[PDB]
Design a protein around this ligand. Structure first.
Ligand SMILES: [Cl-]
Ligand SMILES: [Cl-]
Ligand SMILES: [K+]
Ligand SMILES: [K+]
Ligand SMILES: [K+]
Ligand code: NA
Lengths: 371, 379
């Protein structure tokens, strides 16, 4: 009634992005994948399997607790159905402070359901298999028990509506793979598989130290100047901070900022805390070691898990959560100081690069005034 | 229904004329609170004896569900309080030992209480309900707001039910409340008396070890290191602590989901089998004679032994409705295997203790044999 999918069908782009260039189409997958993975931080979901089917449908299978199946006393339909049909039911029902669900972005499976011509939901929970079918968001029958199972978890298979999605209606394996890998880099210990039924292509993304692995991927076609990547994965006051960095022989700076898996193009408090810690730590090391009074060649990832994050806008390109500056700055001041002393072979190379770049920047400015 | 319980009360709580049933009323409520603790929801239980001979039990659990049961039209809490086996039906926790007569929970306590007050703190609000001989005076209703979660059950035992012994004995409550804290390490159990201001606080991080230290407090241990462990493998939690004293009595206290087994069972059997194999393998290794090894196997009567064997088993099976003998065949294997492994590490880790214990066991067998031969040779 009041809370429904009519809003979504009328203005799809507002919720998932542009429906005519393939961005919205691929985001449909990542809205399902975000609902799967958000259950990972508390240890419920351990493995997500994403499959591109021959019929241009995508299924997402997890091994979580399974979406609740109990009849909502007010709505009179299964808790999973309430979530699928009531636009914001999911985000409201979920207690998880780390899930970033808003009015338009990150709404979840209900958005996917609205723009899907058909949706199949399969829930393994309490030793029973529950199945449901949806057509343009309308259930065909109530969620029903079809069998028995030893496993728990949810499976959502969706067929994008062709009345919504134009021009690009086929999933690009590479778009899915790049984001699924990143998600596994940012959520260590989580297993994410990508399968393609059109050609048999598949990948498996699983890292025990995803933050380190992320910087090794960013530097694979580069020339790292020091052998040891500086990384850490800490949790303090409900704020998880992961950082990995390594200098290359290059002259560009590339810091990749993330807050609850969401990229921050324009940075924020996590970047600022990272920068302040690096300047204080490198200045402290150069002071103490005798080197007299944006960083060329830096490749870094700053990934935070913060409950209820705050952003500068609807785009979520700048993190504004003040407590995240301190949370990042504190840990990186402590642990990068330890890294420089524990790896003086690496620390010599890094400082050597910073000084040579300062010698070149100053001499290049002086060469301008010369002629 | 609760008319059956009111018609034959002692069948459910025990006899209503000697204070056994009366005190069991407390412990049934306390057990419904404790079952939330293994899950990790309930951290503290406060038991209070009120000056009006009512007992209140308060926990910091999740609070009994308040939502309307779509089939019953009344709150899930009310369905649990009024319908006998509703509590054990709704609760998916297999470790909860809900019997047909004994251990049905608060519903039995309610049916036999002339007044019962239930206060649930859940989902940011306080809900209250008043019961009279089992019948609710109004449906569960929100009275106020709260930041805390938990359940409070205050009950006034019926004087038409409980005769001769209608006053709560602090010692009966304290003794069992302490035992329950030994068997559920990490759980805080406070006991208060409003009649004299008397209070106790039972909390142990190593309850199984502490239990044996309490049992050996007015005795003389012959070895300083208590053998103890607390493990879980394939849903069976096994806690064993043991220590020998200079005495000639054997006392092995067996427990299954807090319920004591007077006549032992598969946990006692798994304990005895582990002990025999481990003492026989140690004696084989240490170079003991065939006579000294026979002297320490033949009969399982360990003079000077004090042991506690407590098990957490989902859905245990007993020889009868008394629960005096565990019959769950899979518990022997769980006890036996974990004790064979860890008792063998103990004997190696503490070889002073190992030599004292074996020494004692053979010595008592040599003395009993010596007494038996002295009996034979007497003119
Ligand atoms: Cl593999
Ligand atoms: Cl205290
Ligand atoms: K919420
Ligand atoms: K490291
Ligand atoms: K997210
Ligand atoms: Na963003």
């Amino acid at each position: 009634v009041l809370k429904g999918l009519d809003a979504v069908r009328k203005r799809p782009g507002m919720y998932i992005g542009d429906t005519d260039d393939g961005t919205g189409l691929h985001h449909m997958v990542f809205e399902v994948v975000d609902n799967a993975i958000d259950e990972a931080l508390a240890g419920h979901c351990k493995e997500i399997i994403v499959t591109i089917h021959a019929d241009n449908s995508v299924s997402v299978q997890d091994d979580g607790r399974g979406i609740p199946t109990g009849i909502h006393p007010e709505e009179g339909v299964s808790a999973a159905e309430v979530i699928m049909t009531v636009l914001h039911a999911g985000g409201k029902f979920d207690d998880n402070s780390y899930k970033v669900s808003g009015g338009l972005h990150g709404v979840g499976v209900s958005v996917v359901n609205a723009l899907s011509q058909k949706l199949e939901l399969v829930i393994q929970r309490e030793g029973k298999i529950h199945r449901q079918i949806y057509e343009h968001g309308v259930p065909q029958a109530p969620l029903a028990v079809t069998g028995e199972t030893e496993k728990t978890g949810t499976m959502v298979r969706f067929w994008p509506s062709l009345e919504t999605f134009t021009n690009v209606t086929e999933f690009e394996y590479e778009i899915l793979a790049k984001r699924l890998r990143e998600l596994s880099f940012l959520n260590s210990g989580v297993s994410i598989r990508l399968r393609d039924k059109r050609d048999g292509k598949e990948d498996h993304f699983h890292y025990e130290g995803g933050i380190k692995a992320f910087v090794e991927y960013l530097n694979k076609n580069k020339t790292p100047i020091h052998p040891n990547i500086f990384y850490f994965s800490t949790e303090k006051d409900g704020i998880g901070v992961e950082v990995a960095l390594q200098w290359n022989d290059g002259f560009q700076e590339n810091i990749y900022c993330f807050t609850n898996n969401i990229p921050q193009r324009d940075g924020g408090t996590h970047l600022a805390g990272f920068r302040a810690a690096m300047t204080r730590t490198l200045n402290a090391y150069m002071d103490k070691e005798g080197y007299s009074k944006a960083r060329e060649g830096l490749i870094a990832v700053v990934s935070v898990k913060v409950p209820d994050p705050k952003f500068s806008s609807q785009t979520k390109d700048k993190l504004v959560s003040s407590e995240v500056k301190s949370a990042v700055e504190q840990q990186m001041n402590e642990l990068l100081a330890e890294y420089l002393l524990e790896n003086p072979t690496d620390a010599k190379i890094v400082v050597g690069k910073i000084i040579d770049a300062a010698r070149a920047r100053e001499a290049a400015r002086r060469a301008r005034e010369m002629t």
